From a paper:
Sodium and aspartate symporter GltPh is an archaeal homolog of human glutamate transporters, which clear the neurotransmitter glutamate from the synaptic cleft following rounds of neurotransmission. Briefly, the transporters are homotrimers with each protomer consisting of a centrally located scaffold or trimerization domain and a peripheral transport domain that harbors the L-aspartate (L-asp) and three sodium (Na+) ions binding sites. The crucial conformational transition from the outward-facing state (OFS), in which L-asp binding site is near the extracellular solution, into the inward-facing state (IFS), from which the substrate is released into the cytoplasm, involves a rigid-body ‘elevator-like’ movement of the transport domain by ca 15 Å across the lipid membrane. Here, we report a series of Cryo-EM structures of GltPh reconstituted into nanodiscs in the IFS and OFS.
We then determined the structures of the GltPhIFS complexes with the blockers TFB-TBOA and TBOA under saturating conditions in the presence of 10 mM inhibitors. Surprisingly, HP2 does not open in the same way in GltPhIFS-TBOA. Instead, the hairpin remains mostly closed, but its N-terminal arm separates from the C-terminal arm. The bound TBOA assumes a similar rotomer as TFB-TBOA, though N401 still coordinates the backbone carboxylate. The TBOA benzyl group inserts in between the two arms packing against M311 and M362 sidechains. The movement creates a small opening into the cytoplasmic milieu between the tips of HP1 and HP2. Perhaps, it recapitulates a transient transporter state, in which a Na+ ion has already left the Na2 site while the substrate and two other Na+ ions are still bound.
Author numbering:
A (entry chain A), B (entry chain C), C (entry chain B): 2 to 417
Write the structure that this text describes.
Amino acid sequence: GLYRKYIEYPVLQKILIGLILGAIVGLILGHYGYAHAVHTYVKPFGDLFVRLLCMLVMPIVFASLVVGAASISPARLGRVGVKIVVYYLLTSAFAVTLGIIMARLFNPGAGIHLAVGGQQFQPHQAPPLVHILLDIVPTNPFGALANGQVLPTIFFAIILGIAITYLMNSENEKVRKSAETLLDAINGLAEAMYKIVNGVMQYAPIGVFALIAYVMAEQGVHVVGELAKVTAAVYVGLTLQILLVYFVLLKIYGIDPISFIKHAKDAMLTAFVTRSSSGTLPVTMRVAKEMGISEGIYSFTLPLGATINMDGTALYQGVATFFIANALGSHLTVGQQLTIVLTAVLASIGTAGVPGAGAIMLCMVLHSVGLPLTDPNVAAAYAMILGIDAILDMGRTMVNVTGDLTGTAIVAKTEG
Amino acid sequence: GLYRKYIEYPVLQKILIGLILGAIVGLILGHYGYAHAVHTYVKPFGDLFVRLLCMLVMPIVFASLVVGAASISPARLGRVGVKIVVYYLLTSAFAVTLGIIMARLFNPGAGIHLAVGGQQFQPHQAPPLVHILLDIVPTNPFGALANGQVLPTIFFAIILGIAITYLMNSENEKVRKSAETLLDAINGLAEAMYKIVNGVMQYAPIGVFALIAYVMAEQGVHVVGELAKVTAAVYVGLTLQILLVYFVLLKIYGIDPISFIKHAKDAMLTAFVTRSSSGTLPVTMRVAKEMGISEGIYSFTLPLGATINMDGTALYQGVATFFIANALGSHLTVGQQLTIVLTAVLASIGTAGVPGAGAIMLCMVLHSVGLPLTDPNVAAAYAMILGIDAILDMGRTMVNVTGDLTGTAIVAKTEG
Amino acid sequence: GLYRKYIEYPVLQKILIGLILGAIVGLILGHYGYAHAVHTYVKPFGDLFVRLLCMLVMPIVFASLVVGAASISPARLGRVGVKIVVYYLLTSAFAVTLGIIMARLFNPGAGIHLAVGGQQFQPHQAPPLVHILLDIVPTNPFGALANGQVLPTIFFAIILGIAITYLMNSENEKVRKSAETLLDAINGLAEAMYKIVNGVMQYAPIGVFALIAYVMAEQGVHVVGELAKVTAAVYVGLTLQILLVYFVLLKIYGIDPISFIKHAKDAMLTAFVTRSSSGTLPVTMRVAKEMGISEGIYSFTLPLGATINMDGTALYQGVATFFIANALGSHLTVGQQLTIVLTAVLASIGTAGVPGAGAIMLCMVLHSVGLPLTDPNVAAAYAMILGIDAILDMGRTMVNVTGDLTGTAIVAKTEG
Ligand SMILES: N[C@H](C(=O)O)[C@H](OCc1ccccc1)C(=O)O
Ligand SMILES: N[C@H](C(=O)O)[C@H](OCc1ccccc1)C(=O)O
Ligand SMILES: N[C@H](C(=O)O)[C@H](OCc1ccccc1)C(=O)O
């Protein structure tokens, strides 16, 4: 039973084994001058992995933001809801700004030049500011859904979800059942896409093996230092995010951070091992139960925080969208970084935590900046940043779960 | 509480105030030579209003015509249903023909030449008649839904709704629950789009202010006379529609029109004040109760007439699609006017009455004629016709409610 | 009552009458040199028929394969399910291979050259093998759904259906109701498309009359011999399919074929007369009851076999996609025939049997080979193969029902 041996084996150790064997086989076949053979016989598996993730980008955008804007809408929110939603959004924006800062303080992907076709990627000239601020609103929702265009789909999905929740509180019965049926169908589409991404991340060791094999064979030993710089920038940014943001917010609101980080050890460690937010929700509820938090103020925010409070994933956005920019020669302008901040805050507003979906949110961010996955240079830089996704997901899920308990404790010790 | 002051204030007086202040500020800044400044600092708000309405065009088309063809279908209709549906369609066609006649008898938008880019809008050459009569049927329903193409979406939506009602009367159970689930999801999409257009028409005073400010600053005082000609043509056409059509039909069918128009005073006046058809449905039912109409012959037609019997909105189509044509230098050919008649009859077959959706049906009509909102001349002429939408909606809702009671009385006094 | 006379008249005799009168009127108007008049005054009706079928292609693909992959998925299958699903797929593949063989052994559509615009259809050059094997997976599911692209829609629909069934077996309640709501909405879309194709095949006599009239007037008497060669190739292939495949499989598994083909006479004959698979399901259940088949092993496979076991329809695919290739001068390469095998196996995985849907599966096959219905030569060859669809559907439904009882008997006499 080779198939039942392969699936029952755990995912994280499998991707780590595929990554290590991919680096070894890629460097060995790159020393022997076998780069074109390993290219034409190995690289299509990683291309299939990249194409499966790019397939799963857009329905996750539409359905997840409809459901999440249906879970965040001002039609059904109290004081605790607004009080923690403004905290979650204002923390995600400062986390992606810290990701920009930590990508500027290091140099992820410098030195290497990824002109794979013989020409560098030249960025198309930016429109005026009012043209992009008007082109956020789509002319056609099916049109903006039918070819790329992450930001108009984001706007239309948020507006449609807020309208669905305003529809579910009317005196009529037929429109209430109709809005409930539409919201349940879109929620089923979102959860079906999450089951497909669970299957794709089950396939993911072979794709990581192929991508890292081709990358180590073509670029050489010179790329593992820049990947180590990427890992160092991400983990230093996450540690400084935890320290600065959560510790200063807890000391302003009067909660001692050492006892908090002692009590949150289980909720951090099971998110480090099992790289999921929805899978660590009973452990997070147990940690919030053993802290002194009231029942109706932790039994509402933690299922909301497992959906709308990706704090480390936005820092990974801010580091990775600058690594992919610096690994192509170009650089992002001021006015293209606020697009990263907007499309890293509004993307993590409905996505439930499944392992390996930051690789989908990365294409969501890149498709709105001007670095699309159709050009051959971004498809190589995204491969280089996708090959080390498993050693970053364990980092960017722990702070994603830590921010939930931080916001729950801050909202708890300002009302009672 | 500036926001709760702004929303709780009524909509119609707000749009009238924004229109008057927009005309005043536009003429004053046009006398001082400040046209480029008011352009680049004011016109994007009206562009955002136009882009929100153009966003809301196409899902209203698909979902509203699926629901309305599900409410008009020959699978579930008696004698009264066919007897009033053929009346409603044959009255809407003659109303849009009277709109064409009243646009020809006046001259809406003559004299002005809207070459904003330095070139006039040249119409693309028409295909043969059998090419457009075959291109009514789409090759791809998702394809015709994904880029414009109002008439193929209209055809596919009507066919899908008739198929849904033929599906809901079968002996099986699974396909009955499946058709009910699909129809309820599409109905929820339609009502969600109507809640979005209620929000957009709540935003609408700032957009009307910006559009009329830019229009009075660029074109000058010479455009308010043509807008007055448009209002005069619309209201003369609506008054002659009421008089000729309803009075001669009531005198042929033997009902005295003076006592009818005395009894229908509440249903006319509350539709003039509150510019809605669904909002005046209990008042219309009360007026039909105080007329001598049988219970099962007024308790069926008035919720149907509030959906499929827009008689004044089609006259506004027939006047406005000729105003936008005459304000660009071109003229509509015979064979392009039957497209206006078809896309003004089939558009008002599922749309429930919400205030300010004639501006969406106008883009529905214009996108099928050859005057799309992407070219810069039609986006200015549509702005000029959109800035005075509030002083036309009160006119074109009163006859829209009057035709309901007229058809109810005609169908009542031919059976009992 | 001309309309109620026309609809209540049976469909098959109506299409046969339209075919015979179309051939007669086409040959008579072709002898008098009246080809351009019968073209410009008759051919648009057949073009409307072709456009209605091309409209109904793509939603049947998406919805039918979502439902059929939801009915074939490995999440809910026993030993009997896998045992008969691998039989059905391995029989459909050998049936379409026998269709390729029977199209090679005859010469369907040779001699005639269909350069209607003055130029022959030149095939676009094929990409490498790994490019098409990677382009099976879409980059955008709404994108691949929005312009043609049958194979990416097929892949995404099968993956989404398997994910829906894996979603309907979880411990949560909200995601179970959500997956059930999404699957029921897609099933309602599929059954609505089947009701539309029932209406289009009700219209079909006028379209068959127009297509055969234009074909006999333009090409002449020389095309009825090649159409007779097509009918002979299809029926010889179906008879050899029955004989070889079913008789050798029944003699290997130890069931006497003469008593089987004596008992299956009702289920063959009512499928020959009423050309449907879902309409002959009680007769097929009655035949399996009068054979010696256990209750839980014939009450599961025959509603599955009426959906996923089109054996003669795949042979009609294999003959017709080579007739349309040979009637244009070009020829299909090895590597374009495995596309026919794949898109003739995976297409008949969710489609319930309705009369005249092989004309839709033919466009499904042709749109993935490189013979699209937009070029004017394939739109004439598809007309020539569509005009004789009624005298082929009776053949390709009988073996479609016979394979159900064959697989049921084979699966029955290997377990008990
Ligand atoms: N690890 C994070 C989590 O599960 O919470 C992260 O969350 C998924 C996610 C977060 C934001 C946007 C899309 C998808 C991931 O797994 O990539
Ligand atoms: N005033 C009319 C009404 O509400 O009945 C009119 O009706 C909305 C309508 C009518 C026809 C097509 C689309 C939308 C409008 O408000 O613009
Ligand atoms: N005659 C066959 C049947 O009904 O079983 C055949 O089945 C329909 C079908 C079969 C395969 C793919 C699509 C549609 C047809 O009618 O064309």
